[PDB]
Amino acid sequence: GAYKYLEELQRKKQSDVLRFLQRVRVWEYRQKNVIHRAARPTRPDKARRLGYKAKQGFVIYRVRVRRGNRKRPVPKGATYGKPTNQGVNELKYQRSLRATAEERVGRRAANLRVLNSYWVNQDSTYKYFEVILVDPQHKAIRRDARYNWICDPVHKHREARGLTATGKKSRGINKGHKFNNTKAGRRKTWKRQNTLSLWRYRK
Amino acid sequence: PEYVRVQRQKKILSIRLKVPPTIAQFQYTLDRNTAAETFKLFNKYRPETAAEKKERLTKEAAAVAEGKSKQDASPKPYAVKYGLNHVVALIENKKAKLVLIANDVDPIELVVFLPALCKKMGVPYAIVKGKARLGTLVNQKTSAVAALTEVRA
Amino acid sequence: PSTLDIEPIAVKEFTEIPHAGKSYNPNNKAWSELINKEYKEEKAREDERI
Amino acid sequence: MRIKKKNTRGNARNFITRSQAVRKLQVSLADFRRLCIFKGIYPREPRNKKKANKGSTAPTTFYYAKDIQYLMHEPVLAKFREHKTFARKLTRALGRGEVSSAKRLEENRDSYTLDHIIKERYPSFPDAIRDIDDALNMLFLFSNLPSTNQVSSKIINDAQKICNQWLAYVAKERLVRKVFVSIKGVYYQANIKGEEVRWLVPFKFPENIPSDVDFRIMLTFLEFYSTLLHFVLYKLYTDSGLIYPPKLDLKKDKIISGLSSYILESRKYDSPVASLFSAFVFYVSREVPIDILEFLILSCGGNVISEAAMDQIDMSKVTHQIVDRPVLKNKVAGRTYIQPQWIFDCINKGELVPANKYLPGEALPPHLSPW
Amino acid sequence: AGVKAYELRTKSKEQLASQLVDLKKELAELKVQKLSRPSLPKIKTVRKSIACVLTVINEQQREAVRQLYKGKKYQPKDLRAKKTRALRRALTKFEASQVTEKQRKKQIAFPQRKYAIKA
RNA sequence: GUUUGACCUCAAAUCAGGUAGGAGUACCCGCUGAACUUAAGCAUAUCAAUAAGCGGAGGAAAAGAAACCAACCGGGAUUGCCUUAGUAACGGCGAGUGAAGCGGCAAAAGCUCAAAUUUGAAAUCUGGUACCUUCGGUGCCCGAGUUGUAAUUUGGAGAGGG
RNA sequence: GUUCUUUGUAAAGUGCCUUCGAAGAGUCGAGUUGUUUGGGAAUGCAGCUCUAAGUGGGUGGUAAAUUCCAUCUAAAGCUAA
RNA sequence: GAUGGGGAAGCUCCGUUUCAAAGGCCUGAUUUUAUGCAGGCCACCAUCGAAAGGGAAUCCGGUUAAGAUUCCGGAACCUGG
């Protein structure tokens, strides 16, 4: 079907066709509110590969967030400390902006459980996204065991904990020696390596 | 209301901005006479309504309960193909004889490649105005496409 | 509500009983009486119009 | 407390503009007028227009706001909203080209029933008989007018059926007690469990429609009166044990479509008005009306035959022959002859006045009307 | 010494209302007798009988509402189970038992076999 | 036809059925986040990727069945302990910081979607109504869904045809 | 332990020959800057720019080019101990 | 100091009409489509915020161990219906 056609056309963002469609879409979104529910996804193949069905209880939420480095929340930029605090405006906001958009759409739709999100547009002042969502309360999701896993309380607010794939990327969770600092949680491995074990029979 | 001015400015931007040739091939729609003829032809092969489908199900069940040749007693089906992925799959096979394409699909990217793939495979195609007119014969709110893999002699 | 129980306020008089002068060759007494009364009712408007 | 804002209580609260009622009901004033015709709500005149209208002198109508509050709970408004949604659904089915879906939707619906309104509005069934006079009058009026637009003639057929049923019941029970012919029609009166019930029967002649009247309100009143008279005839038939609705021979309807249709049958006489002209077998000339006269002789128990029945098809037992021709054809010496008027005075009195009177061409007494 | 609830259960609702009005009048009289007396231990009993009659009338109305609502969905929220807020959000046993046809065929094809290692 | 309906979008509902706020917060998942102290009085470094503040669930949480570890006769979900090791390594090579493979043990489970024309039948499903054997089942009626709901396949494999 | 019924015209598995084997894009990757790591030529995270291919891509603890080999298939997801 | 919105990872900040679809009045057989609301007018903002700011209205006599223009006698005045 259209799967691979749209999957390849999305890759040609520099093509004049996507070049004009992206401008029309960024303008239509700039006319719209920073947070609003898109009636349908603009990239059906992307949501389809992100696990979204087209059935009741699923939801899509277009979102907008300002680009730029984090500014430290202190008056006049005061250091109140050692000089080495270079670049008070240079803070990079360790969490990815997509994670912030997911947290915003989840705060707007806290009854819904965030699952995944994908880039759809961006501008100089914003980076647009279209986070998908599902309602655990809907009977269609509670049935069809393939999608019922979200109903578990542990899955609540997955975006806030970083369980979303953007959050898993920001956390560094990946196999390999390169991720040894955060292969299983940075704070967890730090507390484990720093522990002073003391058996009743000292070694 | 802000949504009204938003859609109006969107149409004004679509009219004012230059468009790549692959877009704007829509609005070169088939003439109303040939379009009405194509719809008068497609109307004969509308997909079966769910009530008629349940009637055929009861008929085949009564036939299997007493008769022979299970599921074969019914005549061959004859209905326009309408599924978008199914329509694209019918092309490059190639059982499709014609492929209608709505000009007003909300995601323009979904159908921009359809005319090009049809020109590559050589299957006849046309861009009828209005997805709703294609969906009315389909017994659905919208179908965005229509095709005829088979027809009565 | 009790307000429904009360009858609608009365308006111009009406009676189910037909007048005796519309009685299939009405007797000359009541017939002439009804004719005189309708003639007076018409003559009043005719005088006002004149 | 604090100043009570004069234009907040009293007549301003007890009374409200009819447009305000249509807005509170949000029913577009049409279903509102229909329910008001059904619920019995009527316009009311405030004793002080300045208070009810916030001092305006305009002749604004007022409808006893609490009565409209009682109207808000009426299920029939919900049924009207359901019919409004069904109309849009039928429009969608017709615009989509799926006519079979429109037929399936038309099959899956039922008209609203007024019987609950007939029960809440008329407790003590004889009290329902007290208002019957308007119902029989409106039904006999609508039955006679030629079918026309906004009628569809089905209402005329139901009215003619209910009228024939009421006439057959009045004939089988011999409830007639007085008659009064008039230029506007043949007036009638009959007891109903001892209650009097006057009613008028329009002459069976074509009549022009002024079109100046609001026909829709007359149709709603006819529907209400039809439901009321239907419940009344059902109770009257169950009380007598007669099967209802009465069966009818279709061949009799194709001949004259007269009172003979809808023969009554079970699942002394009033003495004198009942069983009048007992054992008599009257005959009637074509020129005299057949329906208005045959119903009276049948309610009196006399047999009736008409020359009009001979147009399509015995006279071996006739004891009388009504005639009104200016010069009657030579009469049989053994058969009595009399003008139609003789039956009317005989019903008005019951004394069986001598046959020598009312003999054609001799002039009849003017009316000797009972009233 | 005071009304017995099992005796009250047999009474009709009007009888329970009359007994409640009588106990209320007796309590209103004992309230004056208490200020007229150094102590009124007896007042403690009638106030408990009033609460007993009220609880009996409440149980009667509750069982009646449970009877009229029996056998239909969406019972009144006060009658709904009060296990805990978390359990109401927990999936129903029919939902937890749901399985896709693929996993069902995979389970029917190779159910966990029983075995032991002796010979 | 100077009329209607359909599609798309957006609003009103004290509309029918639902969900989130909060508290607790020892443990967990993330953000933000200092200095006292130590190296001469230090601006790299140490304190510390800590204290405080903030958001999110549980009885555990996260992670979890590799774009792994290894260069060997190669092992093979994640997690915890011993050892690797106070070693490789980092650090005005100063203070000080500082891991990971292999080996033994505790406990062992698999796998699921997108990417397939069913097209000889959208076979899927939310909701209302009536009934019953009521954590649900059946008939009927609206609706979601053809811009894609079920089965068929998740690379270990796997699909049309014989 | 027994007790009513089937599902068994329905569903699953194993061999050979044949043609097939789609598998994730503002992503990976690289430039610059902030933070952090034992990671040391820049381990991981993060802001801005550039930004692709499928006999392809990542990894092979010293930065590059050339001829090769060893192991997996990221940019989707659930799972008690 | 909310609401509609714009910031902020966030506890929460800005703003009080600012880029909001911010309801309350009249007519009616709206004349022909017959059981489908058709035709007209309007207009800024929630809320809190002074017991000395504006306010709708009571005067005398008598009375308690302690209350009064509030309690009793008399004669008054304002608001709504």
UniProtKB/Swiss-Prot annotation, chain B:
Any GO MF annotation of the entry: RNA binding
Cellular component terms per the entry's GO annotation: cytosol; cytosolic large ribosomal subunit
Subcellular location: Cytoplasm
Disulfide linkage: none
Principal localisation: cytoplasm
One GO term of the biological process aspect: maturation of LSU-rRNA
Stretches assigned to coiled coil: none
Keyword annotations of the record: Cytoplasm, Ribonucleoprotein, Ribosomal protein
Ribonucleoprotein is among the record's keywords: yes
Complexes and interactors: Component of the large ribosomal subunit (LSU). Mature yeast ribosomes consist of a small (40S) and a large (60S) subunit. The 40S small subunit contains 1 molecule of ribosomal RNA (18S rRNA) and 33 different proteins (encoded by 57 genes). The large 60S subunit contains 3 rRNA molecules (25S, 5.8S and 5S rRNA) and 46 different proteins (encoded by 81 genes).
Note: Present with 238000 molecules/cell in log phase SD medium.
Function: Component of the ribosome, a large ribonucleoprotein complex responsible for the synthesis of proteins in the cell. The small ribosomal subunit (SSU) binds messenger RNAs (mRNAs) and translates the encoded message by selecting cognate aminoacyl-transfer RNA (tRNA) molecules. The large subunit (LSU) contains the ribosomal catalytic site termed the peptidyl transferase center (PTC), which catalyzes the formation of peptide bonds, thereby polymerizing the amino acids delivered by tRNAs into a polypeptide chain.
Family affiliation: Belongs to the eukaryotic ribosomal protein eL8 family.
UniProt protein name: Large ribosomal subunit protein eL8A
Source species: Saccharomyces cerevisiae (strain ATCC 204508 / S288c)
Span of the entire protein shown here: 53 to 205 of 256
Swiss-Prot record, chain C:
Signal peptide location: none
Cell compartment(s), UniProt: Nucleus, Nucleolus; Nucleus, Nucleoplasm
Superkingdom, natural source: Eukaryota
Disruption phenotype: Inhibition of cell growth. Defects in processing of the rRNA components of the 60S ribosomal subunit and accumulation of the corresponding polyadenylated pre-rRNAs. Some delay in the maturation of the 35S primary transcript and 32S pre-rRNA. Delay in 20S pre-rRNA formation and a severe delay in mature 25S and 5.8S rRNA formation, with accumulation of the 35S, 32S, 27S, 26S and 7S pre-rRNAs and a 5' extended form of the 25S rRNA. Complete loss of synthesis of the mature 25S rRNA. Appearance at a low level of aberrant 23S species. Shorter 18S and 5.8S rRNA at the 5' end.
Miscellaneous remark of the record: Present with 1600 molecules/cell in log phase SD medium.
Role noted for this protein: Late-acting factor in the nuclear maturation of 60S ribosomal subunits, which is required for normal acquisition of export competence. Required for the export of the large subunit. Acts to stimulate the RNase activity of the exosome complex, and may recruit the exosome to 7S pre-rRNA for processing. Associates with numerous RNAs including the 27S and 7S pre-rRNAs and the box H/ACA snoRNA snR37. Also interacts (via N-terminal region) with the mature 25S rRNA and the mature 5.8S rRNA.
Protein family: Belongs to the NOP53 family.
Protein name: Ribosome biogenesis protein NOP53
Gene for this chain: NOP53
From Swiss-Prot, chain D:
Covered residues, full protein: 1 to 460 of 605
Keyword terms of this UniProt record: Coiled coil, Nucleus, Phosphoprotein, Ribosome biogenesis, rRNA processing
Protein name: Pescadillo homolog
Purpose of the protein: Component of the NOP7 complex, which is required for maturation of the 25S and 5.8S ribosomal RNAs and formation of the 60S ribosome.
Any one of the GO BP annotations: maturation of SSU-rRNA from tricistronic rRNA transcript (SSU-rRNA, 5.8S rRNA, LSU-rRNA)
Region (Sufficient for interaction with ERB1): 51-371
Subunit structure: Component of the NOP7 complex, composed of ERB1, NOP7 and YTM1. The complex is held together by ERB1, which interacts with NOP7 via its N-terminal domain and with YTM1 via a high-affinity interaction between the seven-bladed beta-propeller domains of the 2 proteins. The NOP7 complex associates with the 66S pre-ribosome. Also interacts with NOG1. May also associate with the origin recognition complex (ORC complex).
A GO term from the CC aspect: PeBoW complex
Domain BRCT: 272-360
Subcellular location: Nucleus, Nucleolus; Nucleus, Nucleoplasm
Main location: nucleus
Note: Present with 4530 molecules/cell in log phase SD medium.
Stimuli inducing this protein: Expression is down-regulated prior to the diauxic shift.
Species of provenance: Saccharomyces cerevisiae (strain ATCC 204508 / S288c)
UniProtKB/Swiss-Prot annotation, chain E:
PROSITE patterns according to UniProt: RIBOSOMAL_L29
Purpose: Component of the ribosome, a large ribonucleoprotein complex responsible for the synthesis of proteins in the cell. The small ribosomal subunit (SSU) binds messenger RNAs (mRNAs) and translates the encoded message by selecting cognate aminoacyl-transfer RNA (tRNA) molecules. The large subunit (LSU) contains the ribosomal catalytic site termed the peptidyl transferase center (PTC), which catalyzes the formation of peptide bonds, thereby polymerizing the amino acids delivered by tRNAs into a polypeptide chain.
Biological process according to GO: cytoplasmic translation; maturation of LSU-rRNA from tricistronic rRNA transcript (SSU-rRNA, 5.8S rRNA, LSU-rRNA)
HAMAP family xref list: Ribosomal_uL29
Phosphoserine PTM sites in chain numbering: 12, 49
Family annotation (Gene3D superfamilies): 1.10.287.310, 6.10.250.3450
PANTHER family (UniProt xref): 60S RIBOSOMAL PROTEIN L35, LARGE RIBOSOMAL SUBUNIT PROTEIN UL29-RELATED
SUPFAM superfamilies linked: Ribosomal protein L29 (L29p) (SSF46561)
Protein's recorded name: Large ribosomal subunit protein uL29A
This protein's UniProt keywords: Cytoplasm, Phosphoprotein, Ribonucleoprotein, Ribosomal protein
Superkingdom of source: Eukaryota
Pfam families: Ribosomal_L29
Keyword Phosphoprotein recorded: yes
Tagged with keyword Endoplasmic reticulum: no
Subcellular location: Cytoplasm
